[PDB]
Structures are given as structure tokens and as C-alpha cells.
UniProtKB/Swiss-Prot annotation, chains A, B:
The gene is pip. InterPro entries: AB_hydrolase_1 (IPR000073), AB_hydrolase_fold (IPR029058), Peptidase_S33 (IPR002410), Pro_iminopeptidase (IPR005944). Coiled coil: none annotated. Belongs to the peptidase S33 family. Its main location: cytoplasm. This is Proline iminopeptidase. Keywords: Aminopeptidase, Cytoplasm, Hydrolase, Protease.
Length: 313, 313
């Protein structure tokens, strides 16, 4: 069973003014002349972390990472203006074009997989391979599974906390009930909601509950951009033309090699979506983790991913 | 079959400052020393009309009417700040107290029946009789029936127009999708949504589609307050503690005489609710209109109401 490569530090860090309002933070790790790869974090609004630098062999890969609009160390933090799927797809191109690469491997998990697919289907010719994890297709049943009813059945105990953040009579469409609070003018009001919404994902992303992950998720500065940008994208349905758009346009990525790693007990994004993606994109290798959850840092998911990365290097 | 009394003008018109922000328009018609009755308009956000002065005998009734917060000729127009069921319940008391009446007949239809009930349950003692029509209990199935799916089956043709206002990916919870638009900063956006939302209740309020009613419902000024105030109360679930509050507390109006007039083919507020109220408050007389719709200006409805009014006079 493979593990993450050793802790590394970017040989270059910077900023890219994508438009007159958003400035993205980017960085590069590994071999400056190695095989190019762009890291797409989840959330949306989560931002990359140091651990995300370790999925690729720094000898063979030129690892490119960056924070998506209003996410992490990109400004303005938690901004919902012009923070849309097709904007993020254009940004990936601005970066690519800016760094001088023609084609590159797209690595993404959770929302990252949603962005990787949207990006690849919009720009097939600039994608060498796709390394997806914890597939999220953003169809309403997926959103509702996590935020309305579904995982609530396995995590009743944690669910009570998410629920309590909303008054009984508004509990019929929890996502919008949260949107009204995460968008409130009162800072206290949107904070209580952002923490409740953020923790929930923190409490259900690993087969075994990770106390530090939960806690890191109730951090007011993280909670704010995560919950707001997450809920923002969900309430608007990913800005897709039609709910099943990623499946509908999957034919554009037909000849793009790739791996689909997904944990069987992933209650954040059910295996269902990886199954459906697989049937629509046969050329990819579905690798199901027998006893893992959503997170990319589950031993089996890490193993599968590192193997995947080495396989294309 | 009775009819509306003749066109009458108020002997007094005014304005009442209920709080440092809201100024309610009110007026009085009829016998200044007659039996007092307060008229609760529907919507919420509809505001009274000239026709509403005519359900009572101007020789026996002191008819009090008023526009509810942000509606009609109350200010500020279309206002959602401190526009809540309990504020409106308080206002009824301010008007009552200000006009020096001790107890009075509450007459309301559609949302008006909701207020009438909320009010009577909070202040049983100041109510002589209740004359309800088009029962609306605000439970979520009622909202979903009219704005998500139900009445859509009988009015396929009209519903296509309501639906077209929202992009397909957001059509899963139409009420919240309209709210985001009716709450937009962009005026053009909230206008388009306000008209679409307001026409829908116009095209379905009478058994026989009334072309003037629809047209009046697409008037920008009326559209804006109606839609925004209506949507605002629904998305928040009538600001009740629990969804079935009006049935829960129906015991408080046990000894209050009343009449429930409902149209069999009322597709805006299904006979369901009139049926359940009636089971919970036995003392009232249920009078179902055989071939009538929602509106109080349905021949059979007008007949039932006028007779009710005269019976209590």
C-alpha cells in the first residue's frame, strides 16, 4: 500500500489577477520540467492544502496548485460575485496559458472531480489524463442525499446538529434555508449557519470520525468561505444548463484516459455517481475502496491515487 | 342569491404609524355607530380594494379596512423588514385600540383567513365572530401544492409560464428559486420574477379565467409588493413555531361563532384545509360552494358571505 510522497514546499508561489476583482493564489511544486498537472481542490471553496502536494512524484511531475475564487488565500475571500463554474473553468485556462503549458493532467476529488469534468468537457485537448476521486456530479438527488435526507440515516447523531441550525418550519428545503442565513447581512447569523453546514461535511468525510478534521471545519475563517461558496453552487445547481450535464457531455472525454477512485462507504458523494460516470466513460478504471469514505486521505484512497499518478508519470 | 352591497366610499381615510418605519393606510365605511368589523385582505401583500367594502350592510356595520405592511398604500411599499405574521397580528391590535373598539368581527379570505386565525388565537377576547373564506393554513403541503406541484396538473397551460421564469436546474424548489430573484439587487430581475409569480395566482383564482384579474396581476407596481411579500411569508413558513400551528391552537377559538366558505374547485387553497379547520373548530358552519373557485367574488361565494354577514348583523 503506497503512501503520500514526503512533505514538500513550492519552488514558486504567486498571484494571478483573473479579472478586475479576483486574485488567485497559485504555486508550483516538484520538477519544474516534469509532467504538468493541475490540482483542483474540493468544496467548492475549500482551497488547497499542503497534503495535496504529495500525490505526485516530485521527480516526474510539475505540480500546479491554486485556490479557487474566494477560497483560501485567494481574494476577495468568501466572495460570491462572479464565482461560477464557467468562471472557474476559464480561470484554469488563464493559469494554463499563463504558465506556458499546452496540455496537462487534471487531478481532482469531490467538487474537484466536478470541476475536472466540466473543464475537460469544455477543453478536451488540454487534458492528458483525469485522476478523479469521490465523484460528484451535482445532480439534485446527490445534493439532497447529503443536505436534505440520505446520509442523515447513517449519521443521526451528527445530523441533529446540522438540523438545529434551522427552525422547524423551514426544514423542508434545508439548502435554501441555509442560503438565506449564509447570505444574511448579520455577521453573527451567517457565522452560526456556516459553522453548522461546514462541520457536517467534516463529521462525515472519513470511515472513522476524525476529531481534528471536524474541528478544523468549525474554524470561523474556513467555515465562512466553505459554507457560503458550497451552498452558493448547490442552490444554483452548479450553473449547469441541465442537471445531468456532466453525464450528457461525457462523450467529449471518451478518449481521455483516467482513473476513478471512490470509497464504498462514501456517504458525502455516494458510489452511485462514480458508477454512473463509469458507465458513461468506459475507458476509465473504476477502483472502489472496500472500506473507505469520502476523503482522499483514506489509506486505500491514497494507495489507489498514488498508484494512479505513478502509472501516468 | 345575494350580491355585494352597492359601491360605497369611506367617511374617513387615514394613516397610522405602527412603528418608526411602517405607516398603515386605513379607512372606515358604513354606519359609524354600527357593528364593528375589520377586513383582512389576502396575499399576503395584496392590499384592500373598493369591492371589499361591500360584503357588509352599511346600515348595520362599521366597516374598518386597512392595508397590511408594505402592501398597497401602506409604506414603505413592498417592504420585508419587520414584515411578519406577529407584527401584522400586533398591528390589528394597534388599529383596534386606536379606534377605540373593544371587540370586533374579523373577516378575511385566503391569507386573510390565516391572519384572522393567527389573530383570533392570540386575542380570542376581541373577536365577536369569524367570517373566513378560501382557508389557507400555511402548512408546507399547501405551499408546495400551489407553487411546486399540484394545481399545475389542472392548469398545465398557465403553469408553463410560471416555470419558464426559473432555469431548469433550479426548478426543484421553486419557492426558494423565486425568492433569490425577488430578493435580487437587480430591479429588472426581481420584476420579471414578480410578474411571473403574481400572474400564476391570477390565472387560477376563478373557476372561469377572468382576463382582467390576470392583467391586473401583471401590473409592475402590484406585482412587486404581492410577489415579494407573498414569497417572503412562504419561504419563512408564516413565521409559525410549528407548521400546523393554526390547527394546533384551534382550541382557543372553540367558542367563537363563525362561517367557513370555501369553493369546491378552489385550486389555490384546496378544500382540504377548509375540511381540516372545520374538524378542529366544529362550531363554525362549513359552506362549500359547488361550482366556485378561490376568489371571494365568485357568485356562490359572494352569496354565502353576504348571507353570513347579514346573519351576524
Amino acid at each position: 500500500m503506497r503512501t503520500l510522497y514526503p512533505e514538500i514546499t513550492p519552488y514558486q508561489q504567486g498571484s494571478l489577477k483573473v479579472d478586475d476583482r479576483h486574485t488567485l493564489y497559485f504555486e508550483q511544486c516538484g520538477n519544474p520540467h516534469g509532467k504538468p498537472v493541475v490540482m483542483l481542490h474540493g468544496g467548492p471553496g475549500g482551497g488547497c492544502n499542503d497534503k495535496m502536494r504529495r500525490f505526485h512524484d516530485p521527480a516526474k511531475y510539475r505540480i500546479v496548485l491554486f485556490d479557487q475564487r474566494g477560497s483560501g488565500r485567494s481574494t476577495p475571500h468568501a466572495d460570491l460575485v462572479d464565482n461560477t463554474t464557467w468562471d472557474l473553468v476559464a480561470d484554469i485556462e488563464r493559469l494554463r496559458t499563463h504558465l506556458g503549458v499546452d496540455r496537462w493532467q487534471v487531478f481532482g476529488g469531490s467538487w474537484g472531480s466536478t470541476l475536472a469534468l466540466a473543464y475537460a468537457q469544455t477543453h478536451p485537448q488540454q487534458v492528458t489524463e483525469l485522476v478523479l476521486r469521490g465523484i460528484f456530479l451535482l445532480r439534485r438527488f446527490e445534493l439532497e442525499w447529503f443536505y436534505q435526507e440520505g446520509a442523515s440515516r447513517l449519521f443521526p447523531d451528527a445530523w441533529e446538529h446540522y438540523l438545529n441550525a434551522i427552525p422547524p418550519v423551514e426544514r423542508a428545503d434545508l439548502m435554501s434555508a441555509f442560503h438565506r442565513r449564509l447570505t444574511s447581512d448579520d455577521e453573527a447569523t451567517r457565522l452560526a449557519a456556516a459553522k453548522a453546514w461546514s462541520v457536517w461535511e467534516g463529521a462525515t468525510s472519513f470511515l472513522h470520525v476524525d476529531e481534528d478534521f471536524v474541528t478544523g471545519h468549525e474554524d470561523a475563517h474556513f467555515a465562512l468561505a466553505f459554507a457560503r461558496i458550497e451552498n452558493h453552487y448547490f442552490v444554483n445547481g452548479g450553473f449547469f444548463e441541465v442537471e445531468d450535464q456532466l453525464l450528457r457531455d461525457a462523450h467529449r472525454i471518451a478518449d481521455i484516459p483516467g482513473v476513478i477512485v471512490h470509497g464504498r462507504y462514501d456517504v458525502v458523494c455516494p458510489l452511485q455517481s462514480a458508477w454512473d460516470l463509469h458507465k458513461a466513460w468506459p475507458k476509465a478504471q473504476l477502483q472502489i475502496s472496500p472500506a473507505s469514505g469520502h476523503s482522499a486521505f483514506e489509506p486505500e484512497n491514497v494507495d489507489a491515487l498514488v498508484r494512479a499518478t505513478d502509472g501516468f508519470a
